[PDB]
Design an enzyme around this catalytic site. Structure first.
Site, PDB file in Angstrom:
ATOM      1  N   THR C   1      58.553  57.101  32.297  1.00  2.00           N
ATOM      2  CA  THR C   1      59.346  58.262  32.681  1.00  2.00           C
ATOM      3  C   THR C   1      59.925  58.975  31.467  1.00  2.00           C
ATOM      4  OG1 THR C   1      61.439  58.952  33.691  1.00  2.00           O
ATOM      5  CG2 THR C   1      61.204  56.629  33.103  1.00  2.00           C
ATOM      6  N   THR C   2      60.729  60.003  31.724  1.00  2.46           N
ATOM      7  CA  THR C   2      61.314  60.821  30.666  1.00  2.46           C
ATOM      8  C   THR C   2      62.696  61.272  31.117  1.00  2.46           C
ATOM      9  OG1 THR C   2      59.223  61.576  29.712  1.00  2.46           O
ATOM     10  CG2 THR C   2      61.153  62.989  29.421  1.00  2.46           C
TER      11      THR C   2
END
Lengths: 232, 242, 195, 241, 240, 133
Positions: C1-2
């Site tokens: 994810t980010t």
């Protein structure tokens, strides 16, 4: 006799525990409650009259259900009644989890009697000052039981406990008939309540509940008012 | 008088009052006199400690502690009670700092210590902590806070207050001083004179005054009075008593 | 994810992707990796979703308790301390990294990063997740000082979009949140809104 | 006829009386203050007498009414230490409720939980039954505002209006005289009725700076503590009218 | 009986006391007197050993806990022995974990905390032993008097036990000289204080006295009849 | 307080000669409210006798009716001042010899007295006036 009316773990030289008797005396001082086992069901009523109309009558209920087909009423203390309600609900659903089957009212009464008698085992914990009326419908037969602070549980075709319980019991002896129907049972119960209500019962002044093959449910103030008008 | 009911801390009275806490009040006013004042930018505490015997070394039975770096700790009552309460306060503050990573506000510490002291006011197997104590702190982003907390378990905020055998006498003359503006420097002289007039000389003589404070004067760090300020305060008290 | 968070004068801006996968299959494309902890304190989760959600609920309960006890909105340092303690206490069995953003009147906008294993640390810009290893050079090339709200929005947009297109574990839509004295504003970017 | 029984909480007296509980109820009135709550169509207002021994006392810390949760407010009297311990326990219960069930506590549920706590407290001989009386107020959807009262006996009840303190009897009588008129009680009307009850039960015509007020409405779900300006406006508006 | 308020440490007196605490305080008075002195560089504890019978050895009253800290008991053997064992364990753990001798102030504060719990909580009796702690730390020698009320005092010298008021007023009289004595003069002063406690018919013989001395470079060592012998040669005659 | 009314009475009467009921009645009402909050002894009586006097002099009655309604429906009225003002009403209700305004005045004096007080006997006097009618 005084020196033995102080502990729950000492036998009086003549009879039995005095604290149990005192708890029963506290039970007798509660709001009158009436249970009737009709041919097709069971009906339990109680009085909710209290001064200071500021009190919200719908906030608390003297009649509560334990499962879809079992209900109860109390005579005596209030908080102890709520604790008993919680214990009964938890225990009934534990039985349901183990067996995936609606709880037989007799077993619920036995086990709730056990849990209340547990509080009578040792000192430092007072017995519940509440007597229970348990109504249920199981296997084509309405069951009405009474559970005691002492842990004794027994059956009752029709009984009345709390304040003025003796005269209500006499009244029930006079009026009860084994061939009674549900609506007539409700009529008899409301009449019993009126016999010692002292102040013109209203729709919310009395709380009643009925159990039958359609489960147990507390009657709303609308049907209570309707039945009160029918009795007048 | 409550005989038959004051034998435990969990028994009410026919009137409905716990006499264990009232006897705790009695013990509190039968103890030393400590006065703490929250200045504009911090707090100061001062303790009247009686030298029972000259054989006692100075600094013995220290009563002005610090529970945290920015939190002081004054107390009157029972010395053993004082030390146990200070230890529990230090433990609570350390737990707060470890769990939350910052300093504990004085209102929160006062509430926690009040609930703890209440936890012994009401049990029967234990007894209430019959000592009343000053909590004080100064934070650059919160302000300057002071608190009386007594054995009953209620923590209340005071700008400057005194406890001991002369609570009424201290209240009589502490009110005349306007507070909310000046700082510790102008309040030290008032503390010295009030403690030198509130102490009784004909009876219960042989006392010494010990002072401490927290605030930006020590970058929000609680520490005892420097010798020079303390001796100046003593000189001012001696001059003012004529 | 980010998950990317950075403070500016007056508050904090924090955004995240919306990809949650169990294998190569995208389990859900509309995930909100930003779980609102308090009224002006926001969280960003990375790693195993179950552990992140569980610790999010636990810290939400603890911080609600702490706030109602102090009757005053909690400090971001406090929250970060709870995240550090919880992550370390279960780091042997916790797969969860948390970026805590928020605003408090004590100082202003604060961002604290807690990556895997429980580094409770503080910095200006914090990027985390599996997509944090693709825009590191891009953010180091594109980061400046003195952002405004509009500039913060564009920075979040392009950085998270580059992480979106370059990483296969970031997808769906972009979630953005700006915390300030005025309050918290939440926005969702989907379609032509992303660059 | 029953002498030694008024010693232990867990001991039943003849005629089934628990004297320790009644003694705790009497101990509630040891504070000497007075609180009263009134509920309208969509508003609930609590008002408490403030007693300041000295200006030395910090008025920001001598409050007698607090806030359990962001929408649930509490006003209570009795032993101050018991009061604060009870509010801490109630806040714990509400937070744990939210943690375990993911939504806010209704007023009745919080009152029932703390009442169960107090009942367990008064059932076993290990406890002094927290002699402080609390009133919780808050908004619940589909049921409007709710005012509930909890006592050391573990008895909780909902009220159209309620009171507590040394003047509980007279305040309740005045509240009954007010409620028998069956009026909708808009927010200002609720506040002024409560203020009138307190003034006539104290017969002091208090200054604005000796009382505290809290209010919860559907449009203001947060339990707001009335600052000086609002209470002064309310009381002067009542006084001229 | 209007004295039902002194049966446990958990009941306050009507006038605001714990009479059990005062009873514990009076308890240590039945023990024999013991006086502690401290020099600029050395600390000495001088105790009157009391024997049950002359056909038996005298009761020891100078317990050693650490090479820098020695203790002297006055009161219950059981409470004093439990306290001494807890001291020995605490010093052992402190040396194990920190490799530095236990600070006297921290040791005495831990005493206060440990003995406060019986005073506050129902159950164990309050520790009814007066302890004299002679320790050495950064500020030199330290003398501590811990009272069965879970309280402690920092005193220049201290006499606790039977007829301790005589030695108390003796030390009050000789206040002016204490801080400048070396080992010989202060040992003689403590011996004279003990002589003040002792009545005329009895003298401080070899079997009667026990002395423990600690210092910067000298460990806390307790002397016996043969070992005390030099220290009693410098003692003078009873002023009768 | 008493200084205010003693310095205001001449100018208040001079303004009353202009009639202008509005501003005088609002000012007198405000002064009555402040003196009732302050709980003054003679100021209340002076204000009430003044307002009743000017209302009688201006040959209108509804304003004095409203004054009695507001003073009755408002709390914190000292007994002595109320007694003095009803005494003045009693000496201001009998001497009028016009049938409709007299019957109206006695009607109001009867209906403004729910919660009879010490000065009830004085109203008894004016009841006998109604006896005559």
């Amino acid at each position: 006799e005084r020196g033995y009316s102080f502990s729950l773990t000492t036998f009086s030289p003549s009879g039995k525990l005095v604290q149990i008797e005192y708890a029963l005396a506290a039970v007798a001082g509660g709001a009158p409650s009436v249970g009737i086992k009709a041919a097709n069901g069971v009906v339990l009523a109680t009085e909710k009259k209290q001064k200071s109309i500021l009190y919200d009558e719908r906030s608390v209920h003297k009649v509560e259900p334990i499962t879809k087909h079992i209900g109860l009423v109390y005579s005596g203390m209030g908080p102890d009644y709520r604790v008993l309600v919680h214990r009964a609900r938890k225990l009934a659903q534990q039985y349901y989890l183990v067996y995936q089957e609606p709880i037989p009212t007799a077993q619920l009464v036995q086990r709730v009697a056990s849990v209340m008698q547990e509080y009578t085992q040792s000192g430092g914990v007072r017995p519940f000052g509440v007597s229970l009326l348990i109504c249920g419908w199981n296997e084509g037969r309405p069951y009405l039981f009474q559970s005691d602070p002492s842990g004794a549980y027994f059956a009752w075709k029709a009984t009345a406990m709390g304040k003025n319980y003796v005269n209500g019991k006499t009244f029930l002896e006079k009026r009860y008939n084994e061939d009674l129907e549900l609506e007539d049972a409700i009529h008899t119960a409301i009449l019993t309540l009126k016999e010692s209500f002292e102040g013109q019962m209203t729709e919310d002044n009395i709380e009643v509940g009925i159990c039958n093959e359609a489960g147990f449910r507390r009657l709303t103030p609308t049907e209570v008012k309707d039945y009160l008008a029918a009795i007048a | 008088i409550g005989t038959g009911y004051d034998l435990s801390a969990s028994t009410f009275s026919p009137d409905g009052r716990v006499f264990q806490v009232e006897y705790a009040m009695k013990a509190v006013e039968n103890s030393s006199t400590a006065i703490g004042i929250r200045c504009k930018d911090g707090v100061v505490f001062g303790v009247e400690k009686l030298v029972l015997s000259k054989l006692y070394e100075e600094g013995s039975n220290k009563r002005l502690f610090n529970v945290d770096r920015h939190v002081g700790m004054a107390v009157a009552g029972l010395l053993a009670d004082a030390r146990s309460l200070a230890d529990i306060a230090r433990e609570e503050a350390s737990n707060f700092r470890s769990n939350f990573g910052y300093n504990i506000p004085l209102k929160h510490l006062a509430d926690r210590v009040a609930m703890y002291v209440h936890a012994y006011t009401l049990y029967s197997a234990v007894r209430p902590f019959g000592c009343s104590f000053m909590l004080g702190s100064y934070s650059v982003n919160d302000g300057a806070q002071l608190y009386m907390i007594d054995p009953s378990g209620v923590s209340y905020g005071y700008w400057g207050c005194a406890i001991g055998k002369a609570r009424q006498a201290a209240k009589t003359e502490i009110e005349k001083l306007q507070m909310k503006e000046m700082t510790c420097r102008d309040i030290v002289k008032e503390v010295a004179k009030i403690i030198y007039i509130v102490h009784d000389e004909v009876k219960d003589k042989a006392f010494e005054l010990e002072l401490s404070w927290v605030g930006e004067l020590t970058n929000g760090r609680h520490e005892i009075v420097p010798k020079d300020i303390r001796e100046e305060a003593e000189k001012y008290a001696k001059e003012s008593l004529k | 994810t980010t998950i990317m968070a950075v403070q500016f004068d007056g508050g904090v801006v924090l955004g995240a992707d919306s990809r949650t996968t169990t294998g190569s299959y995208i389990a859900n494309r509309v995930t909100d990796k930003l779980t609102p902890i308090h009224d002006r304190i926001f969280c960003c989760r990375s790693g195993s979703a179950a552990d992140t959600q569980a610790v999010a609920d636990a810290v939400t309960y603890q911080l609600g308790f702490h706030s109602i006890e102090l009757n005053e909105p909690p400090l971001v340092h406090t929250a970060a301390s709870l995240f550090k303690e919880m992550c370390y206490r279960y780091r042997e069995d916790l797969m969860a990294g948390i970026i805590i953003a928020g605003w408090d009147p004590q100082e202003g906008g604060q961002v604290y990063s807690v990556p895997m294993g429980g580094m409770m640390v503080r910095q200006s810009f914090a990027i985390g997740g599996s997509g944090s290893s693709y825009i590191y050079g891009y953010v180091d090339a594109t980061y400046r000082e003195g952002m405004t709200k509009e500039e913060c929005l564009q920075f979040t947009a392009n950085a998270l979009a580059l992480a979106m297109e370059r990483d296969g574990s970031s997808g769906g839509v972009i979630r953005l949140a700006a915390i300030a004295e005025s309050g918290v504003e939440r926005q969702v970017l989907l379609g032509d809104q992303i660059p | 006829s029953s002498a030694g029984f008024d010693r232990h909480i867990t001991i039943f007296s003849p005629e089934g009386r628990l004297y320790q509980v009644e003694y705790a109820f009497k101990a509630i009135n040891q504070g000497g203050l007075t609180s009263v709550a009134v509920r309208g169509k969509d508003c609930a207002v609590i008002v408490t007498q403030k007693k300041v021994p000295d200006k030395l006392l910090d008025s920001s810390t001598v409050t007698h009414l607090f806030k359990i949760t962001e929408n649930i407010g509490c006003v209570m009297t009795g032993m101050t230490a018991d009061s604060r311990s009870q509010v801490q326990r109630a806040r714990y219960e509400a937070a744990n409720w939210k943690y375990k069930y993911g939504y806010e506590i209704p007023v009745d549920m919080l009152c029932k939980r703390i009442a169960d706590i107090s009942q367990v407290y008064t059932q076993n001989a290990e406890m002094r039954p927290l002699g402080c009386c609390m009133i919780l107020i808050g908004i619940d959807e589909e049921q409007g505002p709710q005012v509930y009262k909890c006592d050391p006996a573990g008895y909780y009840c909902g009220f159209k209006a309620t009171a507590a303190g040394v003047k509980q009897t007279e305040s309740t009588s005045f509240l009954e005289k007010k409620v028998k008129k069956k009026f909708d009680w808009t927010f200002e009307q609720t506040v002024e009725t409560a203020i009138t009850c307190l003034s006539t039960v104290l017969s002091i015509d208090f200054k604005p700076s000796e009382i505290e007020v809290g209010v919860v409405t559907v449009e203001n779900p947060k339990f707001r503590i009335l600052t000086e300006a609002e209470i002064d406006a309310h009381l002067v508006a009542l006084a001229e009218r | 009986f209007r004295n039902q308020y002194d049966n446990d440490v958990t009941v306050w007196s009507p006038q605001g006391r714990i009479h059990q605490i005062e009873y514990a305080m009076e308890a240590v008075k039945q023990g024999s007197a013991t006086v502690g002195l401290k020099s600029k560089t050395h600390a000495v504890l001088v105790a009157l050993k009391r024997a049950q019978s002359e056909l038996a050895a005298h009761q020891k009253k100078i317990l050693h806990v650490d090479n820098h800290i020695g203790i002297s008991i006055a009161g219950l053997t059981a409470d004093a022995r439990l306290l001494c064992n807890f001291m020995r364990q605490e010093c052992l753990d402190s040396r194990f974990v920190f490799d530095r001798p236990l600070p006297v102030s921290r040791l005495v504060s831990l005493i206060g905390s440990k003995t406060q719990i019986p005073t506050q909580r129902y159950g164990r009796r309050p520790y009814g032993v007066g302890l004299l702690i002679a320790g050495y730390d950064d500020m030199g020698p330290h003398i501590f008097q811990t009272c069965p009320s879970a309280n402690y005092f920092d005193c220049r010298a201290m006499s606790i036990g039977a007829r301790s008021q005589s030695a108390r007023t003796y030390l009050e009289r000789h206040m002016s000289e204490f801080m400048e004595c070396n080992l010989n003069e202060l040992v003689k002063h403590g011996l004279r204080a003990l002589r003040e406690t002792l009545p005329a018919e009895q003298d401080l013989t070899t079997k009667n006295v026990s002395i423990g001395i600690v210092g910067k470079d000298l460990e806390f060592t307790i002397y016996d009849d043969d070992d005390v012998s030099p220290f009693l040669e410098g003692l003078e005659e009873r002023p009768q | 307080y008493s200084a205010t009314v003693d310095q205001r009475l001449p100018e208040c009467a001079k303004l009353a000669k202009e009639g202008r009921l509005q501003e005088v009645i609002e000012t007198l009402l405000s002064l009555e409210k402040q003196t009732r909050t302050a709980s003054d002894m003679v100021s209340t009586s002076r204000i009430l006798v003044a307002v009743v006097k000017m209302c009688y002099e201006a040959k209108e009655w509804d304003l004095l009716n409203e004054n009695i309604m507001l003073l009755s429906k408002r709390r914190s009225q000292l007994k002595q001042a109320v007694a003095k003002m009803v005494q003045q009403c009693c000496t201001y209700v009998e001497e009028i010899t016009d049938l409709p305004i007299k019957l109206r005045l006695i009607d109001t004096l009867r209906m403004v007295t729910e919660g009879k007080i010490y000065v009830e006997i004085e109203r008894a006097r004016l009841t006998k006036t109604l006896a005559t009618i």
